[PDB]
Write a protein that binds this ligand. Structure first.
Ligand SMILES: [Zn+2]
Lengths: 305, 147, 177, 101, 69, 131
C-alpha cells in the first residue's frame, strides 16, 4: 500500500444529489475510514441551534423546560461558518457577542374570536393565534448582524413545525440565544436527519439456474434485481444496487445450495439527509475535512514524555 | 475505613481477590456468565481464524499491559498456525497468547486435561473438541465453556 | 530550598565582602567539579536525570550568583576567579546538561551574560535543547515541584513600602548589578 | 503548545525506543482504528494496536513496536502524516467527482 | 402530548406533519401507510413517530382555567 | 530439514458443523498402512474426495514476520502451509504408530509404520500441502 495506489483505485459515484439528501458510493476505501466520515457527519459537524431560552412569561399548558427543549430541536437555516464559537469561561455579559450568538424572540397572546361561525370545531376560527409555529420565531439582529445577515434572515428550515397551542388569555414570551455546537454534545446540533451507509450487494450464483427455477429464484429478490435472460433461459443479476439483502433466497431449500450472498466489500453506499441548514455535500465535505484536521492537529502537537 | 489498620485488613483479609473459593465446600464462586460463555464457544471453535491484524488487536484490547501485570514490558505473540497461503491464527491461539502474557515468565506453562459440556458428536465425525487439553500453557484441543 | 536561599543571598546582600562571595563561588565550583568527576559516569547508566536534582540546584545557585556579581570575579589581571571561563563550559557540555534542567529564565540570563563575558557559550546547547523538545528524561509528576522550587527566590525585591526603604542599605536591586 | 494531549507511558517503553505506548486524551475508535491501519502499513512496524481502557474515560492507548530501523515515535509520526495525506487524497477525489458530476 | 418536533432516531423534522397527516386520513381517505409515505416518512424510525402519535394535548386543552365555561 | 512426505488420496471431506473447516480422511498411495486425518481451512484450500494431496512435515523452512522483499523458503514449493505442535504419540500395534498434531486447534492424526515415521519428534513442525 501507498497513498498513490489508493488514489488510482479510489472512486466516487453520485447516484442522486438534492438540496436535502445525497446518495453516493465510495468505492475501494477501507471500512475504518468510511466509518470515520459517518461518525463525524453525525456528531462533529457544527450547527446552529437554540441553546439558552429566556422566558418572561408562559401561561400555556406546556411547561417552560419542555417548550425550551422543542425550540432547541428546531433546525435553524443558518450557515455555521457565519458564526464563531462561544468561550464558556467568560461571564454572561462577555460570553455573548454578534459573532457568537443569534437571538430569536417569540411573542404570542391568544384571544377569543367573536366572529366565529357558530358551531365551529376548528381552533383557527374559534381562537386567534391558538397555534404557535416555528415560523413565529422572529429573528432579532444584533450589532453588525443587521448588515451580515441582511441577505439571509434567520428562518427555521421547517416553518410549519407545531411548537405550542394556546387558549384565550394565555401568552408566551421568550428570547432564545442560538450558538454553535456539535451532535456529540447534544443531538439538536447534529446536522443530519441521518447519515448512514450500507455495503453494496453482491449476489453471485454458484451454477446456472433456469426454467421454472429461474422464475422462482427471481422472486426471492425485489423487482429488477434478478433478470431472466432470453436464450440461455438462465437467471443472471441485473443490478444488485436495488437489492435490500432480505436473505429471502436462503429460506427456500432448493436455492440455499446455489447462491452466496456477499458485498463488494469496502464499496460503501452512503445516504446523507440534511436537517436543513447545509446541503448534504457540504456536510460530507466538512466531515472529510474534520478528519484531516484531527490528523494534522495531532502531527503538530509535541509529545510530552 | 478510616485508618491504616482497617486499610490493611480490607486489602488483605476481606478483599475480593482471595475469595475465589467458598468456605462451604471449597469451590469457585467467581466466573463469567451469559455473553461470555456463548462468546467462548464461538471464539475457540475450530472454524475460528484471525488475520495478523485481528489477532494482535484482540490481544491488546484485553491484556491491558499498562498495569501491574508487567510480566514483560513487551507483548509476546505466537507464530501463526497457517503460514501459507495466508497468515492465520486460531482462536485457541488467542487464549494461549493471553495466558502467555499474564502468567509468570520464570515459570512453565499450565498443564491440564479436562472436559467441557459439549459432546464430540455435536461437532462432527472424529471430533475431540469435548476434550480440553492445555500443554505447556497452550490450548491444543477443545473449546472453552461454562465448565 | 537552601540552595535557592544561598544563591539569592549572595546575589542580593549588599554588605557582603568580595571574598565572602568568592568563598561561596569557591565552594560551589569545588563541590561541582567533584560531582562531575565522580558521577558523570552514572548518566548513561540506568535511572533518570532527576537522580541529579541536587547537581542542577547547586549549578543554578552558582549561575545565579554569577549573574548578579560577575563584575567581581575578575581579578586585577582581568583573569577569572575560580577559572569561571574554563569551568562553566565544562558543566554546560557535560552529560548532565544543566541548561536543560535548571530554571529557564536564569539559564537564559546566564547565557546572555556568560556569552558577553567570553566566559561560556551556551546558546547552541539551548537551541539543541528545545529542538529535541519539539521533535535525559524525567517523570514530570515530580519534575514540576522542582521547576517550582527553582523559580522561587526568597530575596527577590520586597513590596512593603517602609521595609523596602529600610532594606535599601542592605539590598542590590537588579538595576544596580 | 498543548502538553496534556498525548503522553508516553514510560512503563511499557523500552530503552532503545523501538517499542512504546502512548496515551491520547479525547480520542476514541474514530482516530484510533484509522491510525493503527495506517501505522501497520509501515514495513518496519512489528506490532501495533489501540485500546480503550474504559468508555467513561476519554482515553486512547496506542502501542507501537518496530523491527529496529526506526523508533516507535518515528512510526507514530509517519502514521500521523500518512493519515493526513490519505485524507487529502479523498478530499481531492471527491471534489473532482462533484465537479465532473 | 403534542407532536414531537424531530423523530427520536432519524433527527428528521416531523412536527410539521401532524395536521396534514390527519387531513390525509380524513379528507383524501387514504390508509395510514400511504399517507405516511406521501409526507416523506421513509424510514420506519420516522413512520413510527406520526403513525403512533397521541394528540393528548387536545384533551388537556378542554380544561382552561382562564374562561367562563 | 524435511521429516516426512507422501502422496495421500482423500477418502472423505466432512464439513462437520463448521463452514470454513473440513475434516479430511486420506490414505497413502505408497504405504498400505499409512493413513491420515486432518482439519483444513477449506475456504483457503478447497478439497474434494478423490483429490491427491502431497503432504510434507518439516522441522523448519530453508521468528515469523510478514514476507519482505525477496524472501525465499520451503513454503514457496507448496499451496497450503500450517505451523503447529506434536502433542501425543501412541503405539497402535507391534508395528504401527500414530502421532498427533495441533495447528492452533485444527487436528492432525498421522498413523503409519514405525520406520516410515522415524523422524517425527514431539516438537513443533510445519505442515506443507500441495495439489
Ligand atoms: Zn422517524
Amino acid at each position: 500500500w501507498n497513498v498513490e495506489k489508493f488514489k488510482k483505485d479510489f472512486e466516487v459515484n453520485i447516484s442522486s444529489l438534492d438540496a436535502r439528501e445525497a446518495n453516493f458510493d465510495l468505492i475501494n476505501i477501507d471500512t475504518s475510514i468510511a466509518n470515520a466520515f459517518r461518525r463525524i457527519m453525525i456528531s462533529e459537524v457544527p450547527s446552529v441551534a437554540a441553546e439558552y431560552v429566556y422566558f418572561f412569561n408562559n401561561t400555556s399548558v406546556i411547561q417552560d423546560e419542555v417548550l425550551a427543549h422543542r425550540i432547541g430541536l428546531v433546525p435553524l437555516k443558518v450557515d455555521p461558518d457565519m458564526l464563531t464559537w462561544v468561550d464558556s469561561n467568560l461571564p454572561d455579559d462577555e460570553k455573548f457577542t454578534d459573532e457568537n450568538t443569534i437571538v430569536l424572540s417569540l411573542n404570542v397572546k391568544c384571544t377569543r374570536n367573536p366572529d366565529a361561525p357558530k358551531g365551529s370545531t376548528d381552533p383557527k376560527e374559534l381562537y386567534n393565534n391558538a397555534h404557535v409555529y416555528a415560523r413565529d420565531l422572529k429573528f432579532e439582529p444584533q450589532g453588525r448582524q443587521s448588515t451580515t445577515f441582511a441577505d439571509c434572515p434567520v428562518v427555521p428550515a421547517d416553518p410549519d413545525i407545531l411548537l405550542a397551542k394556546l387558549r384565550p388569555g394565555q401568552e408566551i414570551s421568550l428570547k432564545a440565544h442560538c450558538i454553535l455546537g456539535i451532535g456529540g454534545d447534544h443531538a439538536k446540533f447534529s446536522p443530519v436527519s441521518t447519515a448512514s451507509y450500507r455495503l453494496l450487494p453482491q449476489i453471485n450464483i454458484l451454477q446456472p439456474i433456469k426454467g421454472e427455477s429461474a422464475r422462482r429464484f427471481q422472486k426471492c429478490f425485489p423487482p429488477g434485481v434478478i433478470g431472466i435472460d432470453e436464450g440461455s433461459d438462465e437467471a443472471y443479476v441485473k443490478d444488485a444496487r436495488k437489492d435490500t439483502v432480505s436473505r429471502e433466497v436462503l429460506r427456500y431449500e432448493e436455492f440455499a445450495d446455489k447462491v452466496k450472498l456477499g458485498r463488494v466489500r469496502n464499496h460503501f453506499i452512503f445516504n446523507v439527509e440534511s436537517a436543513g441548514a447545509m446541503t448534504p455535500e457540504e456536510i460530507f465535505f466538512k466531515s472529510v475535512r474534520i478528519l484531516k484536521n484531527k490528523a494534522e492537529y495531532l502531527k503538530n502537537c509535541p509529545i510530552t514524555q | 475505613p478510616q485508618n491504616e489498620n482497617a486499610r490493611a485488613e480490607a486489602l488483605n483479609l476481606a478483599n475480593t481477590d482471595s475469595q475465589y473459593l467458598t468456605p462451604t465446600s471449597g469451590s469457585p464462586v467467581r466466573g463469567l456468565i451469559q455473553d461470555h460463555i456463548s462468546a467462548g464457544v464461538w471464539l475457540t471453535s475450530k472454524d475460528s481464524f484471525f488475520t495478523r491484524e485481528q489477532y494482535q488487536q484482540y490481544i491488546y484490547g484485553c491484556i491491558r499491559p499498562e498495569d501491574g501485570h508487567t510480566t514483560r514490558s513487551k507483548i509476546v505473540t505466537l507464530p501463526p498456525t497457517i503460514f501459507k497461503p495466508y497468515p492465520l491464527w486460531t482462536g485457541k491461539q488467542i487464549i494461549t497468547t493471553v495466558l502467555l502474557n499474564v502468567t509468570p515468565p520464570d515459570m512453565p506453562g499450565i498443564n491440564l486435561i479436562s472436559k467441557n459440556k459439549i459432546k464430540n458428536e455435536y461437532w462432527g465425525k472424529g471430533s475431540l473438541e469435548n476434550e480440553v487439553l492445555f500443554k505447556d500453557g497452550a490450548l491444543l484441543c477443545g473449546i472453552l465453556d461454562k465448565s | 530550598k537552601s540552595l535557592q536561599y544561598l544563591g539569592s543571598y549572595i546575589a542580593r546582600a549588599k554588605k557582603l565582602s568580595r571574598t565572602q562571595i568568592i568563598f561561596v563561588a569557591s565552594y560551589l565550583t569545588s563541590w561541582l567539579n567533584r560531582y562531575v568527576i565522580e558521577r558523570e559516569e552514572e548518566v548513561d547508566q540506568r535511572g533518570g536525570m532527576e537522580r541529579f536534582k541536587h547537581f542542577y540546584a547547586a549549578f543554578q545557585a552558582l549561575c545565579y550568583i554569577f549573574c548578579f556579581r560577575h563584575n567581581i570575579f575578575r581579578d586585577t589581571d582581568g583573569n577569572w576567579e575560580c577559572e569561571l571561563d574554563k569551568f562553566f563550559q565544562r558543566m554546560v557540555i557535560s552529560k548532565f546538561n544543566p541548561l536543560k534542567f535548571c530554571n529557564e529564565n536564569v539559564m537564559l540570563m546566564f547565557a546572555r551574560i556568560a556569552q558577553q563575558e567570553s566566559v561560556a557559550y551556551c546558546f547552541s546547547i539551548i537551541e539543541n535543547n528545545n529542538n529535541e523538545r519539539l521533535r535525559s528524561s524525567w517523570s514530570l509528576a515530580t519534575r514540576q515541584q522542582f521547576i517550582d522550587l527553582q523559580s522561587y527566590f526568597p530575596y527577590d525585591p520586597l513590596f512593603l513600602k517602609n521595609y523596602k526603604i529600610l532594606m535599601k542599605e542592605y539590598y542590590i536591586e537588579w538595576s544596580e548589578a | 503548545p498543548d502538553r496534556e494531549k498525548i503522553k508516553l507511558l514510560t512503563q511499557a517503553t523500552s530503552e532503545d525506543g523501538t517499542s512504546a505506548s502512548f496515551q491520547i486524551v479525547e480520542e476514541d475508535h474514530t482516530l484510533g482504528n484509522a491510525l493503527r491501519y495506517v501505522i501497520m502499513k509501515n514495513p518496519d512496524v512489528e506490532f501495533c494496536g489501540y485500546s480503550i481502557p474504559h468508555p467513561s474515560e476519554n482515553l486512547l492507548n496506542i502501542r507501537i513496536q518496530t523491527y529496529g530501523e526506526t523508533t516507535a515515535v518515528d512510526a507514530l509520526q509517519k502514521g500521523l502524516k500518512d493519515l493526513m495525506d490519505l485524507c487529502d487524497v479523498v478530499e481531492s477525489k471527491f471534489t473532482e467527482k462533484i465537479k465532473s458530476m | 402530548m403534542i407532536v414531537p418536533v424531530r423523530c427520536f432516531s432519524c433527527g428528521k423534522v416531523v412536527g410539521d406533519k401532524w395536521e396534514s397527516y390527519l387531513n390525509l386520513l380524513q379528507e383524501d381517505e387514504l390508509d395510514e401507510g400511504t399517507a405516511l409515505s406521501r409526507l416523506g416518512l421513509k424510514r420506519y424510525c420516522c413512520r413510527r413517530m406520526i403513525l403512533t402519535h397521541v394528540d393528548l394535548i387536545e384533551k388537556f386543552l378542554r380544561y382552561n382555567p382562564l374562561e367562563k365555561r | 530439514n524435511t521429516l516426512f512426505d507422501d502422496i495421500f488420496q482423500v477418502s472423505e471431506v466432512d464439513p462437520g458443523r463448521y463452514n470454513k473447516v473440513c475434516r479430511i480422511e486420506a490414505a497413502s498411495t505408497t504405504q498400505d498402512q499409512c493413513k491420515l486425518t486432518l482439519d483444513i481451512n477449506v475456504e483457503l484450500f478447497p478439497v474434494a474426495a478423490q483429490d491427491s494431496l502431497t503432504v510434507t512435515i518439516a522441522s523448519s523452512l530453508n521468528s515469523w514476520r510478514p514476507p519482505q522483499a525477496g524472501d525465499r523458503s520451503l513454503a514457496d514449493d507448496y499451496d497450503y502451509v500450517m505451523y503447529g505442535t506434536a502433542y501425543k504419540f501412541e503405539e497402535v500395534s507391534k508395528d504401527l504408530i500414530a502421532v498427533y498434531y495441533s495447528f492452533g486447534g485444527l487436528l492432525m492424526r498421522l498413523e503409519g509404520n514405525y520406520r516410515n515415521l522415524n523422524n517425527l519428534k514431539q516438537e513443533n513442525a510445519y505442515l506443507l500441502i500441495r495439489r
